[PDB]
Design an enzyme around this catalytic site. Structure first.
Site, PDB file in Angstrom:
ATOM      1  CB  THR G   1      -0.742   0.028   1.260  1.00  0.00           C
ATOM      2  OG1 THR G   1      -1.984  -1.126   0.946  1.00  0.00           O
ATOM      3  CG2 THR G   1      -1.447   1.356   1.636  1.00  0.00           C
ATOM      4  CB  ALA G  49      -8.169  -5.426   3.496  1.00  0.00           C
TER       5      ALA G  49
HETATM    6  C1  LIG Z   1      -1.557  -3.653  -0.561  1.00  0.00           C
HETATM    7  C2  LIG Z   1      -0.755  -3.163   0.801  1.00  0.00           C
HETATM    8  C3  LIG Z   1       0.719  -2.575   0.124  1.00  0.00           C
HETATM    9  O1  LIG Z   1      -0.359  -4.358   1.368  1.00  0.00           O
HETATM   10  C4  LIG Z   1      -1.895  -2.216   1.602  1.00  0.00           C
HETATM   11  O2  LIG Z   1      -1.154  -2.340   2.827  1.00  0.00           O
HETATM   12  C5  LIG Z   1      -3.244  -2.926   1.711  1.00  0.00           C
HETATM   13  C6  LIG Z   1      -4.239  -2.157   2.142  1.00  0.00           C
HETATM   14  C7  LIG Z   1      -5.461  -2.503   1.815  1.00  0.00           C
HETATM   15  C8  LIG Z   1      -6.948  -1.955   2.463  1.00  0.00           C
HETATM   16  C9  LIG Z   1      -6.758  -0.607   2.712  1.00  0.00           C
HETATM   17  C10 LIG Z   1      -8.134  -0.160   3.557  1.00  0.00           C
HETATM   18  C11 LIG Z   1      -9.277  -0.872   2.421  1.00  0.00           C
HETATM   19  C12 LIG Z   1      -9.195  -2.014   2.367  1.00  0.00           C
HETATM   20  C13 LIG Z   1      -7.983  -2.551   1.839  1.00  0.00           C
HETATM   21  N1  LIG Z   1      -3.367  -4.103   2.422  1.00  0.00           N
HETATM   22  C14 LIG Z   1      -3.786  -5.196   2.049  1.00  0.00           C
HETATM   23  O3  LIG Z   1      -3.996  -5.438   0.666  1.00  0.00           O
HETATM   24  C15 LIG Z   1      -3.574  -6.645   3.043  1.00  0.00           C
HETATM   25  C16 LIG Z   1      -2.238  -6.823   3.205  1.00  0.00           C
HETATM   26  C17 LIG Z   1      -2.065  -7.760   4.235  1.00  0.00           C
HETATM   27  C18 LIG Z   1      -2.609  -9.197   4.331  1.00  0.00           C
HETATM   28  C19 LIG Z   1      -2.562  -9.711   5.245  1.00  0.00           C
HETATM   29  C20 LIG Z   1      -2.431  -9.085   6.788  1.00  0.00           C
HETATM   30  O4  LIG Z   1      -2.275 -10.064   7.517  1.00  0.00           O
HETATM   31  C21 LIG Z   1      -2.341  -9.503   9.031  1.00  0.00           C
HETATM   32  C22 LIG Z   1      -2.034  -7.897   6.686  1.00  0.00           C
HETATM   33  C23 LIG Z   1      -2.072  -7.231   5.364  1.00  0.00           C
HETATM   34  N2  LIG Z   1      -4.514  -7.617   2.198  1.00  0.00           N
HETATM   35  C24 LIG Z   1      -5.429  -7.876   2.754  1.00  0.00           C
HETATM   36  O5  LIG Z   1      -5.998  -7.997   4.029  1.00  0.00           O
HETATM   37  C25 LIG Z   1      -6.022  -9.271   1.979  1.00  0.00           C
HETATM   38  C26 LIG Z   1      -7.143  -8.543   0.989  1.00  0.00           C
HETATM   39  N3  LIG Z   1      -6.905 -10.262   2.843  1.00  0.00           N
HETATM   40  C27 LIG Z   1      -5.966 -11.100   3.372  1.00  0.00           C
HETATM   41  O6  LIG Z   1      -4.790 -11.363   3.391  1.00  0.00           O
HETATM   42  C28 LIG Z   1      -6.778 -12.406   4.280  1.00  0.00           C
HETATM   43  N4  LIG Z   1      -6.744 -12.049   5.717  1.00  0.00           N
HETATM   44  C29 LIG Z   1      -7.350 -13.390   6.405  1.00  0.00           C
HETATM   45  C30 LIG Z   1      -7.238 -13.692   7.670  1.00  0.00           C
HETATM   46  O7  LIG Z   1      -6.034 -12.830   8.139  1.00  0.00           O
HETATM   47  C31 LIG Z   1      -5.835 -11.700   7.803  1.00  0.00           C
HETATM   48  C32 LIG Z   1      -5.350 -11.650   6.052  1.00  0.00           C
END
Ligand SMILES: *C[C@@](C)(O)[C@](*)(O)[C@H](CCC1CCCCC1)NC(=O)[C@H](Cc1ccc(OC)cc1)NC(=O)[C@H](C)NC(=O)CN1CCOCC1
Ligand SMILES: *C[C@@](C)(O)[C@](*)(O)[C@H](CCC1CCCCC1)NC(=O)[C@H](Cc1ccc(OC)cc1)NC(=O)[C@H](C)NC(=O)CN1CCOCC1
Ligand SMILES: [Mg+2]
Ligand SMILES: [Mg+2]
Ligand SMILES: [Mg+2]
Ligand SMILES: [Mg+2]
Lengths: 233, 196, 223, 222, 204, 195, 212, 195, 196
Positions: G1, G49
């Site tokens: 992000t 997210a």
């Molecule tokens: C993309 C980036 C560079 O990582 C950003 O930090 C981004 C912010 C997206 C968010 C902003 C607010 C609106 C909704 C979208 N983060 C992510 O895409 C995030 C990365 C991530 C993944 C896992 C995690 O674990 C603790 C932390 C951060 N992605 C997600 O959350 C994705 C969509 N979902 C998952 O990974 C599945 N989850 C299942 C259960 O445990 C948590 C992870």
């Protein structure tokens, strides 16, 4: 969290035109030790449902008592307990499925795979599976453990889709089940020759068969097999 | 696996079940576990199928080359070759072998070679996963200098029980009789031995 | 993989599905698992795809040179012995599971070989993730003195059982028939029960749809 | 050690049209390399013109749908039979999923229906309840296979007007229901070919102002 | 940690009517950091084209290795190597490193100069050959490419149509992978002309 | 070793390398030159594991100097970088690999062009207009993406480098004790003594 | 992000990318990383997210309850501290959150508070948060002055996200821009990177590393 | 948080605390005040795990401020330090302990004496003429052992502190971005704005 | 440990060895593993000595309180109380108990409760580490409705073999006879049973 100790192997089943068949061998294994040779793993509930259970036998005996207690409880303040308010297969299943999923969610599962076979009030065939994870599914043929790998392929050749059910008689369906039990006796190291079979028919009711044996076994070809490659004597 | 070798008046008999398992699946229900390293020197194999076959093939080679040079090897000599391979490669092998053979001088002899690669000369020997269940039975019922018919019954009854209790054992009961008369193969099916 | 082999009146037959998998995705829909060792010796393979392919080719190469050296038809026991000794040497690290079958001057033969170097003799065998589905069919229907017509049916049925009921196995059925006193007949795509249905739409694009930055001719020729 | 999670495979697909929405899913249910069922419905009518699917671990998926259906029932009781709007349903599902933040429902959830202006809506969730409104979404095992195709065919990505050099993008259009169903069917046929966990049958639920209609199509059973 | 997804990137190949197409993205990264936007993954030895995805040091090493081997082949054989033979050479060379493999996903593409027959092939890291009639995919967005190819592809496409199909398959697959993109190259290969096209794509 | 930067301008290559040498708790030195002259028009900066860095650099230096005497000729920067890459690519499958990342900045006297090669410890070679190893690139590539032009002078290249160093001094946690800057052009290699 | 927020002469600039990832899988290119708490309060979102969406939506509820009870707009300091105290209760449980609470109030002026899931709360003029923060910092710190035009400041924030969208594999999609003033926040559009990149390249003469 | 120093001279206590706040890769801030005024003549500096530091400091501040209102009286530095120590000693056997180390510099208005207490996260209290937490003391205690005298003026105390900070800037790997210095004496607490 | 209970014409007999081991050291060579939960309901204990004693003490308490209120409990009832404790605390217990008892209505009954906490009503039962060695022997030699003298011999011969092969078993063979006549304790020393 635990580990299963005394265990039961495959439960196999299928739908046919007027009802359902379910079967399971009479063994309680203690790891590789074939410890208990008289264990009944098909447990009837009323005259319209049979619950077949594999996996841990202590947890099976617990479930058996829950079902026995369920019948008692249904009869309480129920003048139609042996008629319109009798226990249905779908009621018995949903109860078990609730319990199984609750127990897995507390990280203390009932270490079993369960098939509920029966016939509903309206004559409809009921056949549904549930296991230690609370995972549920229905199909024209259902089987647990080794049965899933070996029995289902054979039973699916008889009933491959929903439309094959009305075309399958009770004689053909039972024949397929009995053959499947022989195949499992050839190939499952934790199975036995002695088994029980239950037919739940919408017309003829519940027929429970005990002390069946796998028969017409092919072993004669064994005499000619010699060594593991090059040996001639 | 359930394997045994039993000396008797006229020579020695080897006996085995026919089940091979990969976990709980029976990979082969008609396995031949009685294997020939020489005309009248056989062995029963337990443990890793790959290892025991690899060893048995090497021993057969060694005894064939012994025979070309020095004439018929003793059963003791065959057991020693098995031992040498098992002991020296104990870190890389899972092999439990019973060696049985008939000389005219020594008559019937049985040598057992467990996991370590030690050798033990015995009147009879039992091995494999299913042997645990018949120590009591075999000790009580074994006699020395039995007849051929008695020894066949002793093995049949013994392995019948081993098969009954051990999931890893099953199928047919194969036997190989080693006497002055020659080499006789016997087979016994479930419908016969289960009702004993 | 679903591979199988069984014997009949005056021969042996091998069967195989045509699916290869990489994790949970299909890597190949039409791969040849029944391999050539000699003109009348064939090998079904399962397990690690490169390993089963490489080990059969190597032994096939050495069998050819042995046949030339000895001026004899190769024997199935030679392929068997060479395969098991090679596989044993590598302690299972060459993860190949094989059903070897063939015809030679000794007769017809059918063996299985596991990755650690163990071998089995049998009248009907199956290996791979679909072995249990196949063995269920073989245990139900196999008998002594099968005709060729019954044997091809049973072999293909055993493979089909794997194709339908096992996620590891799929696509088509390959067969090889090795009969005494006859040329071995290799029948690739013997069954084709999984042709893809016609698509609803054509996704052919209008030309110029893709944006291009540069163009150039590549010189592929010499001088 | 006991593992409370499993993987029942499958794949689901939501597409939002102009005055309709579809939620499609394959009917296969698996564990490891075994087929449990060739027809186990995965996409459910939840009432109030909302369709739902929770693909992944089937026990958690059933639990969630069961809880949401119940949430619709109690929304009626507590708020005078008021229709639960798709945006409100989505926010409710976030809280159901985030409620188990530290022992998650191991599923990828998609809901579909119509928004309060009668336009097609698809909402898409991660396992712990993060969500967003989208025109297009595939979920599950073959989501990686199907989503790029939908980027191309539903949202016209990387597609330009011919003869414009590459400076006028293909303009965005709503698709007809007939066109969407063609793209759904081809997506699943394609996904079945290359993914071992996808197959057996395809069940599509179509949502319009008139209600919820079903269509079923055979998929390859290998 | 996983060598096949440190650097990232993709290759796809397709057959058409009397033609083949092979394409690749241009990204080289160190996990999240994008390093180079000019790292081509397609090489050619005469008229045989080789795409290679995976660990970038092995991509470069294998290119140098197959240049070496095909040069010596040509000197001894007195002819350019053909695609079918080169496929076998790739497989052999990968399998000789069975227990210490090159972490790569090679793709062969070309037209046999004698028979005129279009030819494509793909390999796993230890040399298992997939000889497809339709298409081959490789790299960190291989799942995405499989999905695009399996829906977009039809047989017997003309060269200029096949260009559009393979380009759209690559571009849309790359846009769903963090470790692919940053530019792309498409080779359209006919029996005696080869056109190379750089594609305009999103640079994130 | 921490920060090594490289930028290729119109008529030269500029390499900037940090002066700090830190062993755990203490900063043992604040004037360390993390570079070796391989040939008169080719300079290699390096960073990685202690000991391995210098051992590798001096080993490469000795081999290129040996080549120069044998042939009475300077290898092109491209040739030197390919030699270095192969040594690292050989190294990664050794008993104990060289954990060393390098930048090779050279002026090709044949083509009259500056050239900058970035090679990591795996043997991953890339020719670039500007490069960095380790955490440096996380801060400095966005700057260079913004401000770089291919036709820049050496003075403009140095100003652009000051902007990179200022950003690193602002946002990096480690005190890298400033940078030694070296310019590689047609006239050879010289050190900018005031930076 | 990649999210950033910085203070300048004409208020606060807030810019975020739009990508969400599940490992190397690009989960979405159209994600909203700015939450509109009230007409004078914004929250940037980076990390989990669900964690971000849930707790920043929750923060908005707690900010609404404050103004109902106190008949007054919640201060940026108070709003940030409600969230920082909440995540601190959950410390160790595994919440993943990095946020800038950006807003104007009469008593504080324009204010930015960085809050994260390990309990850190910092007031400051410039913040960049997320996997692409270092790239945004590079561009931002070099061209930052206190006295940019609102037009120049909006461009720099946009350009700093673009820089990070390009280099960071896990950042991209599009750029959402906001400008916070005395009178409140103002949305300055969604800018797709697949069009913006090329536009910026040509007009600015930057990105000479790319084949264009 | 990195470096916190404290020195007790004749008539005052001087606390110096670093300005950097680093989260992994980046330096998020370079002007952070790692201190809270507990009472008018008692100042607590702090360093440790992110979040825990400020939460603990503000919690202590609230409790001492509450005491001051209730009794209309300022607790002695000794009493405040004993309160703080007990809270940390209670903390170490909790479900989740406060990972915070503190220095408490106070002027006792009763005894007319400056007092410096050093307390670690375990609740280990010591009264000292000079103190430090973490890796700071490894460099600065040898200096203070050499140069300290009990009868030093506040200006001499600040010069001795400059010598400590110079040594830390020379030999520590991390850039801690300078120190905020605060003096605690009979007149209260004031910040030295140029250091 | 080697324990067994055997129903016969007049009632039931429990049998056990007397060895308790801590690894290879024999902590007690004269242990009494036949333990009384009621007048004519006894049990044989195997597994953790602490656990089985703790369970047996709780069962004795429950049956004493049952007797005060409802009169003499059945053997089935005793087995059920054992089961309840074993099953519900399966994660924290290593207990393998054979419950044997005499009613006048039901005559001799034997219930076995293995590790899981399942219950199995059987004509006879064997348990403990040394039971593995006598499955074969006991299956072949057990008959229903044996006399008292036959059942004593059956147990004596069985446990003799179990003791012979299992290092964990040994010492004296204790037995407890449960009939209408009452409760009889028997003991058999090594010099008697070893020579069988
Ligand atoms: C993309 C980036 C560079 O990582 C950003 O930090 C981004 C912010 C997206 C968010 C902003 C607010 C609106 C909704 C979208 N983060 C992510 O895409 C995030 C990365 C991530 C993944 C896992 C995690 O674990 C603790 C932390 C951060 N992605 C997600 O959350 C994705 C969509 N979902 C998952 O990974 C599945 N989850 C299942 C259960 O445990 C948590 C992870
Ligand atoms: C797919 C199935 C049903 O398992 C078959 O066994 C099939 C047999 C193909 C083979 C038959 C003989 C002719 C040549 C083709 N096997 C595969 O497709 C195989 C499955 C597999 C994968 C991994 C594995 O690890 C222990 C065992 C078996 N697939 C592959 O080998 C694919 C092509 N490659 C990989 O998965 C990557 N390899 C990486 C290095 O370790 C080995 C796997
Ligand atoms: Mg299948
Ligand atoms: Mg990308
Ligand atoms: Mg990017
Ligand atoms: Mg003893």
């Amino acid at each position: 969290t635990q580990q299963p100790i005394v265990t039961g192997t495959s439960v196999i089943s299928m739908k046919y035109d007027n009802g359902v068949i379910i079967a399971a061998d009479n063994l309680g294994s203690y790891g590789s030790l074939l410890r208990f040779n008289g264990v009944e793993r098909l447990i009837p509930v009323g005259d319209n449902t049979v619950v077949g259970i594999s996996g841990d036998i202590s947890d099976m005996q617990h479930i058996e008592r829950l079902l026995k207690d369920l019948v008692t409880e249904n009869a309480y303040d129920n003048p139609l307990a042996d008629a319109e308010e009798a226990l249905e297969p779908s009621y018995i299943f949903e109860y078990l499925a609730t319990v199984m999923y609750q127990r897995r969610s507390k990280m203390n599962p009932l270490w079993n795979a369960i098939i509920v076979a029966g016939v509903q009030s309206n004559g409809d065939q009921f056949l549904r599976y549930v296991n230690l994870l609370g995972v549920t599914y229905s199909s024209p043929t259902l089987a647990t453990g080794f049965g899933a790998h070996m029995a289902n392929p054979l039973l699916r050749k008889v009933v491959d889709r929903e439309s094959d059910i009305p075309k399958t008689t009770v004689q053909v369906a039972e024949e397929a089940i009995v053959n499947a039990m022989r195949v499992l006796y050839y190939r499952d190291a934790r199975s036995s020759r002695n088994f029980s079979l239950a037919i739940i028919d919408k017309n003829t009711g519940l027929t429970f068969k005990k002390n069946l044996q796998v028969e017409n076994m092919k072993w004669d070809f064994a005499k000619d097999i010699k060594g593991y490659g090059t040996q001639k004597i | 696996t359930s394997i045994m070798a039993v000396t008797f008046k006229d020579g020695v008999i080897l006996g085995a079940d026919s089940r091979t398992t990969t976990g709980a699946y029976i990979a082969n229900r008609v396995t031949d576990k009685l294997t020939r390293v020489h005309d009248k020197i056989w062995c029963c194999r337990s443990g890793s199928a790959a290892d025991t076959q690899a060893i048995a093939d090497i021993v057969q080679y060694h005894l064939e080359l012994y025979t070309s040079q020095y004439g018929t090897p003793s059963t003791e000599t065959a057991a020693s070759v098995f031992k040498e391979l098992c002991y020296e490669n104990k870190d890389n092998l899972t092999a439990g072998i019973i060696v049985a053979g008939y000389d005219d001088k020594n008559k019937g002899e049985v040598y057992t070679i467990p996991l370590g690669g030690s050798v033990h000369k015995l009147p009879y020997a039992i091995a494999g996963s299913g042997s645990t269940f018949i120590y009591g039975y075999c000790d009580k019922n074994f006699r020395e200098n039995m007849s051929k018919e008695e020894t066949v019954d002793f093995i049949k009854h013994s392995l019948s029980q081993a098969i009954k209790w051990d999931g890893s054992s099953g199928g047919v009961i194969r036997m190989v009789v080693l006497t002055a008369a020659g080499v006789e193969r016997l087979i016994f099916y479930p419908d016969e031995y289960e009702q004993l | 993989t679903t591979i199988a082999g069984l014997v009949f009146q005056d021969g042996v037959i091998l069967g195989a599905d045509t699916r290869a998998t990489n994790d949970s995705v299909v890597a190949d829909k039409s791969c040849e698992k029944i391999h050539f060792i000699a003109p009348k010796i064939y090998c079904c393979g399962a397990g690690v795809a490169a390993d089963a392919e490489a080990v059969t080719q190597l032994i096939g190469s050495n069998i050819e040179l042995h046949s030339l050296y000895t001026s004899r038809e190769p024997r199935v026991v030679s392929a068997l012995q060479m395969l098991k000794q090679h596989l044993f040497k590598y302690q299972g690290h060459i993860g190949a599971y094989l059903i070897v079958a063939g015809v030679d001057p000794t007769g017809s033969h059918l063996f299985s070989i596991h990755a650690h170097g163990s071998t089995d003799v049998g009248y009907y065998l199956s290996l791979g993730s679909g072995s249990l589905a196949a063995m269920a069919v073989l245990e139900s229907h196999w008998k002594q003195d099968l005709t060729k017509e019954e044997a091809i049916k049973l072999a293909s049925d055993a493979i089909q059982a794997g194709i339908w009921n096992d996620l590891g196995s799929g696509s088509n059925v390959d067969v090889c028939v090795m009969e005494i006193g006859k040329d071995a007949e290799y029948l690739r795509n013997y069954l084709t029960p999984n042709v893809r249905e016609e698509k609803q739409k054509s996704y052919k694009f209008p030309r110029g749809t893709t944006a291009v930055l540069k163009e150039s001719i590549v010189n592929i020729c010499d001088i | 050690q006991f593992n409370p999670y499993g993987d029942n495979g499958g794949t689901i697909l939501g597409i939002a049209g102009e005055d309709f929405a579809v939620l499609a899913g394959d009917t296969r249910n698996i564990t490891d390399y075994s087929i449990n069922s060739r027809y186990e419905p995965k996409v459910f009518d939840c009432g109030d013109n909302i369709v739902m699917s929770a693909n992944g671990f089937a026990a958690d998926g059933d639990a969630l749908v069961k809880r949401f259906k119940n949430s619709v029932k109690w929304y009626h009781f507590d708020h005078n039979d008021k229709k639960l709007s798709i945006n409100s349903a989505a926010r409710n599902i976030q809280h159901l999923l985030y409620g188990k933040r530290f022992f998650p429902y191991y599923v990828h959830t998609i809901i579909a229906g119509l928004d309060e202006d009668g336009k097609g809506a698809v909402y898409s969730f991660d396992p712990v309840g993060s969500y967003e409104r989208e025109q297009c979404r595939a979920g599950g095992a073959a989501a990686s296979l199907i989503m790029p195709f939908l980027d191309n065919q539903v949202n016209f990505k990387n597609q330009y007007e011919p003869g414009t050099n590459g400076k006028v993008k293909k303009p965005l259009k709503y698709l007809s229901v007939e066109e969407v169903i063609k793209l759904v069917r081809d997506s699943f046929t394609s996904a079945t070919e290359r993914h071992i966990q996808v197959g057996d049958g395809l069940e599509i639920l179509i949502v319009t102002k008139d209600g919820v209609r079903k269509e079923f199509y055979e998929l390859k059973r290998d | 940690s996983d060598p096949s997804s440190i650097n990232g990137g993709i290759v796809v190949a397709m057959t058409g009517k009397d033609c083949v197409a092979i394409a690749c993205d241009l990204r080289l990264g160190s996990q999240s950091l994008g390093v180079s936007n000019k790292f081509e993954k397609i090489f050619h030895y005469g008229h045989v084209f080789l795409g290679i995805t995976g660990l970038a040091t092995d991509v470069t090493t294998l290119n140098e290795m197959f240049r070496y081997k095909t040069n010596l082949y040509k000197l001894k054989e007195e002819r350019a190597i053909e695609p079918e033979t080169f496929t076998q050479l790739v497989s052999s060379s990968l399998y000789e490193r069975r227990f210490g493999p090159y972490f790569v996903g090679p793709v062969v593409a070309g037209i046999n100069s004698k028979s005129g027959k279009p030819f494509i092939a793909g390999f796993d890291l230890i040399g298992c050959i997939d000889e497809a009639k339709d298409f081959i995919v490789s790299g960190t967005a291989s799942d995405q490419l499989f999905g695009m190819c399996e829906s977009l592809y039809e047989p017997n496409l003309e060269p200029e149509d096949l260009f559009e199909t393979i380009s759209q398959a690559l571009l849309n697959a790359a846009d769903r992978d963090a470790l692919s993109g940053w530019g792309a190259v498409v080779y359209i290969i006919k029996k005696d002309e080869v056109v190379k096209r750089y594609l305009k794509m999103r640079q994130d | 070793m921490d920060i090594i930067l490289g930028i290729r301008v119109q008529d030269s290559v500029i390499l900037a390398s940090s002066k700090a040498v830190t062993r755990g708790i203490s900063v043992l030195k604040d004037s360390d030159d993390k570079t070796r002259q391989l040939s008169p028009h080719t300079l290699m900066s390096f960073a990685g594991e202690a000991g391995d860095t210098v051992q590798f650099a001096e080993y490469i230096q000795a081999n290129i100097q040996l080549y120069s005497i044998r042939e009475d000729y300077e290898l092109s920067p491209q040739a030197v970088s390919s030699f270095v890459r192969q040594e690292l690519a050989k190294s990664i499958r050794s008993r104990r690999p060289y954990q060393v990342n390098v930048l090779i900045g050279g002026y090709d006297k044949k083509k009259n062009k500056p050239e900058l090669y970035q090679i990591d410890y795996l043997g991953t070679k890339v020719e670039l207009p500007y490069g960095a190893h380790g955490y440096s690139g996380f801060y400095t590539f966005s700057l260079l993406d913004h401000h770089y032009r291919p036709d820049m002078t050496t003075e403009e290249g140095l100003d652009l480098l000051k902007l990179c160093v200022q950003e690193l001094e602002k946002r990096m946690p480690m005190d890298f004790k400033g940078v030694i800057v070296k310019i590689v052009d047609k006239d050879g290699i010289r050190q900018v003594d005031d930076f | 992000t990649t999210t950033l927020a910085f203070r300048f002469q004409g208020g606060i600039i807030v810019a975020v990318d739009s990508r969400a990832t599940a490992g190397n899988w690009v989960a979405s290119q159209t994600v909203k990383k700015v939450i509109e708490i009230n007409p004078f309060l914004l929250g940037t979102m980076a990390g989990g997210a669900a964690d971000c969406q849930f707790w920043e939506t929750w923060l908005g509820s707690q900010c609404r309850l404050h103004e109902l009870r106190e008949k007054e707009r919640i201060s940026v300091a108070a709003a940030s501290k409600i969230l920082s105290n909440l995540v601190y209760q959950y410390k160790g449980a595994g919440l993943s959150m990095g946020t800038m609470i950006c807003g104007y109030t009469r008593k504080e002026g324009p204010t930015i508070y960085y809050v994260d899931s390990d309990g850190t709360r910092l007031k400051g003029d410039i913040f960049c948060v997320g996997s692409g923060q270092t790239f945004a910092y590079g561009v931002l710190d070099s061209n930052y002055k206190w006295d940019l035009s609102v037009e120049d400041a909006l461009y720099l924030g946009k350009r700093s996200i673009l820089a990070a969208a390009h280099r960071d594999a896990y950042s991209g999609g599009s750029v959402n821009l906001y400008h916070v003033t005395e009178d409140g926040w103002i949305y300055h559009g969604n800018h797709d990177v697949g069009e913006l990149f090329w536009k910026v390249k040509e007009e600015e003469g930057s990105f000479n590393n790319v084949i264009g």
